[PDB]
Short mmCIF file of C-alpha atoms (C1' of nucleotides) in Angstrom, two decimals:
data_model
loop_
_atom_site.label_atom_id
_atom_site.label_comp_id
_atom_site.label_asym_id
_atom_site.label_seq_id
_atom_site.Cartn_x
_atom_site.Cartn_y
_atom_site.Cartn_z
CA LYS F 138 -18.38 -15.35 26.53
CA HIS F 139 -22.02 -14.49 27.21
CA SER F 140 -22.06 -11.71 29.84
CA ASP F 141 -23.63 -8.37 28.99
CA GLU F 142 -20.30 -6.59 29.49
CA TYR F 143 -18.79 -9.03 26.98
CA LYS F 144 -21.41 -8.20 24.35
CA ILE F 145 -20.95 -4.43 24.70
CA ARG F 146 -17.15 -4.67 24.57
CA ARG F 147 -17.42 -6.84 21.44
CA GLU F 148 -19.84 -4.40 19.81
CA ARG F 149 -17.43 -1.56 20.54
CA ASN F 150 -14.47 -3.53 19.21
CA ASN F 151 -16.32 -4.41 16.01
CA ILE F 152 -16.97 -0.67 15.54
CA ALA F 153 -13.27 0.10 16.09
CA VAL F 154 -12.15 -2.67 13.74
CA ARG F 155 -14.41 -1.38 10.94
CA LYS F 156 -13.06 2.13 11.54
CA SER F 157 -9.43 0.97 11.58
CA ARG F 158 -9.86 -1.07 8.38
CA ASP F 159 -11.50 1.88 6.60
CA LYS F 160 -8.59 4.09 7.69
CA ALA F 161 -6.11 1.57 6.27
CA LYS F 162 -7.99 1.53 2.96
CA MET F 163 -7.66 5.32 2.81
CA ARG F 164 -3.94 5.14 3.59
CA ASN F 165 -3.38 2.64 0.77
CA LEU F 166 -5.30 4.89 -1.62
CA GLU F 167 -3.12 7.80 -0.52
CA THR F 168 -0.01 5.73 -1.17
CA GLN F 169 -1.27 4.94 -4.68
CA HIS F 170 -1.94 8.66 -5.21
CA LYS F 171 1.61 9.47 -4.08
CA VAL F 172 3.06 6.99 -6.59
CA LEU F 173 1.12 8.73 -9.38
CA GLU F 174 2.25 12.19 -8.22
CA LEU F 175 5.91 11.18 -8.01
CA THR F 176 5.68 9.51 -11.44
CA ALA F 177 4.26 12.73 -12.91
CA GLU F 178 6.94 14.89 -11.26
CA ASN F 179 9.62 12.44 -12.46
CA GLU F 180 8.40 12.77 -16.04
CA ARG F 181 8.30 16.58 -15.73
CA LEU F 182 11.87 16.80 -14.43
CA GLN F 183 13.25 14.36 -17.01
CA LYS F 184 11.64 16.35 -19.82
CA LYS F 185 13.14 19.52 -18.31
CA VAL F 186 16.58 17.87 -18.29
CA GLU F 187 16.20 16.80 -21.92
CA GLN F 188 14.95 20.26 -22.91
CA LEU F 189 18.07 21.85 -21.44
CA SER F 190 20.22 19.31 -23.29
CA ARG F 191 18.52 20.00 -26.63
CA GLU F 192 18.91 23.75 -26.15
CA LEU F 193 22.60 23.34 -25.37
CA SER F 194 23.22 21.05 -28.36
CA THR F 195 21.73 23.66 -30.70
CA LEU F 196 23.80 26.25 -28.82
CA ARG F 197 26.99 24.29 -29.58
CA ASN F 198 26.08 22.93 -33.03
CA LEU F 199 25.82 26.38 -34.63
CA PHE F 200 28.66 27.77 -32.47
CA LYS F 201 31.25 25.86 -34.48
CA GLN F 202 33.83 28.56 -35.29
CA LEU F 203 34.13 31.25 -32.64
CA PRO F 204 36.32 33.90 -34.37
CA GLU F 205 40.08 33.40 -34.03
CA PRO F 206 41.45 36.45 -35.89
CA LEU F 207 45.12 35.66 -35.27
CA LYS N 208 -19.11 -28.35 10.75
CA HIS N 209 -21.24 -29.89 7.99
CA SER N 210 -19.19 -32.92 6.94
CA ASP N 211 -15.68 -34.25 6.43
CA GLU N 212 -15.64 -32.56 3.03
CA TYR N 213 -16.47 -29.36 4.93
CA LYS N 214 -13.40 -29.73 7.15
CA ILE N 215 -11.03 -30.37 4.24
CA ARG N 216 -12.47 -27.49 2.20
CA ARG N 217 -12.05 -25.16 5.19
CA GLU N 218 -8.50 -26.39 5.79
CA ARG N 219 -7.65 -25.70 2.15
CA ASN N 220 -9.27 -22.27 2.30
CA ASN N 221 -7.35 -21.35 5.45
CA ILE N 222 -4.15 -22.26 3.57
CA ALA N 223 -5.20 -20.15 0.58
CA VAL N 224 -6.14 -17.20 2.79
CA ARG N 225 -2.82 -17.21 4.65
CA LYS N 226 -1.01 -17.38 1.29
CA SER N 227 -3.14 -14.57 -0.16
CA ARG N 228 -2.56 -12.33 2.87
CA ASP N 229 1.21 -12.90 2.73
CA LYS N 230 1.17 -12.00 -0.97
CA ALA N 231 -0.66 -8.76 -0.17
CA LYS N 232 1.91 -7.91 2.52
CA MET N 233 4.71 -8.36 -0.02
CA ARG N 234 2.81 -6.23 -2.54
CA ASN N 235 2.48 -3.41 0.00
CA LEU N 236 6.21 -3.61 0.76
CA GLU N 237 6.84 -3.36 -2.98
CA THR N 238 4.76 -0.19 -3.12
CA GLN N 239 6.74 1.30 -0.22
CA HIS N 240 9.97 0.41 -2.03
CA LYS N 241 8.64 2.04 -5.20
CA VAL N 242 7.90 5.26 -3.29
CA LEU N 243 11.49 5.32 -2.01
CA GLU N 244 12.91 4.70 -5.49
CA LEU N 245 10.81 7.41 -7.14
CA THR N 246 11.73 9.82 -4.33
CA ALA N 247 15.44 9.14 -4.90
CA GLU N 248 15.11 9.55 -8.67
CA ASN N 249 13.18 12.79 -8.20
CA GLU N 250 15.98 14.15 -6.00
CA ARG N 251 18.60 13.10 -8.57
CA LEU N 252 16.71 14.83 -11.39
CA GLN N 253 16.07 18.03 -9.42
CA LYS N 254 19.77 18.21 -8.56
CA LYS N 255 20.62 17.74 -12.24
CA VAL N 256 18.24 20.57 -13.20
CA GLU N 257 19.80 22.84 -10.56
CA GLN N 258 23.32 21.91 -11.68
CA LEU N 259 22.52 22.81 -15.28
CA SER N 260 21.05 26.11 -14.07
CA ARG N 261 24.16 26.95 -12.02
CA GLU N 262 26.46 26.11 -14.93
CA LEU N 263 24.40 28.38 -17.19
CA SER N 264 24.27 31.35 -14.82
CA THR N 265 28.03 31.28 -14.25
CA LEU N 266 28.53 31.03 -18.02
CA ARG N 267 26.51 34.20 -18.65
CA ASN N 268 27.79 35.92 -15.50
CA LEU N 269 31.34 35.91 -16.85
CA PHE N 270 29.80 36.93 -20.19
CA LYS N 271 30.07 40.73 -20.17
CA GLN N 272 30.15 43.29 -22.99
CA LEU N 273 31.14 40.53 -25.39
CA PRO N 274 32.95 42.17 -28.33
CA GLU N 275 30.88 44.53 -30.46
CA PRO N 276 33.66 46.44 -32.27
CA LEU N 277 31.08 48.58 -34.14
"C1'" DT E 242 -14.28 -30.56 -7.52
"C1'" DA E 243 -10.00 -26.21 -7.85
"C1'" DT E 244 -7.40 -21.88 -5.66
"C1'" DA E 245 -7.65 -16.66 -4.86
"C1'" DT E 246 -9.68 -12.63 -2.76
"C1'" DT E 247 -12.32 -10.03 0.55
"C1'" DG E 248 -15.95 -8.22 4.18
"C1'" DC E 249 -16.71 -9.46 8.89
"C1'" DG E 250 -16.06 -11.08 13.76
"C1'" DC E 251 -13.03 -12.70 17.26
"C1'" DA E 252 -9.33 -12.41 20.57
"C1'" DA E 253 -4.93 -10.94 21.45
"C1'" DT E 254 -2.24 -7.20 21.65
"C1'" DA E 255 -0.79 -2.26 21.46
"C1'" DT E 256 -1.49 2.58 22.59
"C1'" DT P 260 -12.94 0.94 32.12
"C1'" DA P 261 -11.02 3.37 26.83
"C1'" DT P 262 -10.06 2.94 21.48
"C1'" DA P 263 -6.66 1.17 17.75
"C1'" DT P 264 -4.30 -2.52 15.40
"C1'" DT P 265 -3.51 -7.13 13.80
"C1'" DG P 266 -3.19 -12.52 13.14
"C1'" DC P 267 -6.60 -15.84 12.23
"C1'" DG P 268 -10.94 -18.28 10.75
"C1'" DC P 269 -15.18 -18.04 8.37
"C1'" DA P 270 -18.25 -17.63 4.45
"C1'" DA P 271 -19.22 -15.33 0.38
"C1'" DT P 272 -17.50 -14.21 -3.77
"C1'" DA P 273 -14.32 -14.04 -7.76
"C1'" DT P 274 -11.26 -16.25 -11.05
#
DNA sequence: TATATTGCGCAATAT
DNA sequence: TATATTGCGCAATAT
């Protein structure tokens, strides 16, 4: 339209749209950051699992003969 | 509204834009799905770490004054 | 003469 | 009389 109330409401909506779009950009960046954090924690936990496995293999490899006197 | 070539170019761009925006929506869904998958794998790995801890503590808890005949 | 992506406004809709 | 979100077109830009 062309009324003065129309122009002010449009100006305000354009402001809100810019704000909402900027907020969505920040959310998407936060989602990317979360993917990186979970990937790092996944690699930490998997290395921890493997570490425990390697320490148990060495614990069983050398164990071979637990004394059986009789 | 410059020419007939203008109208066809705009029609083709509107098609491309709708396609591009749909592709972005599917990409964002893929990122959400990835977050869920990493979250599930992180819970599986943390449970595995805790299981290995519990099986080690109970192993050494029954371990007591293991023979030292001197 | 091609499609793909993106900042912006609009209008409809949602809160 | 409020802002927030979203489908769509436009024009500029990128590939």
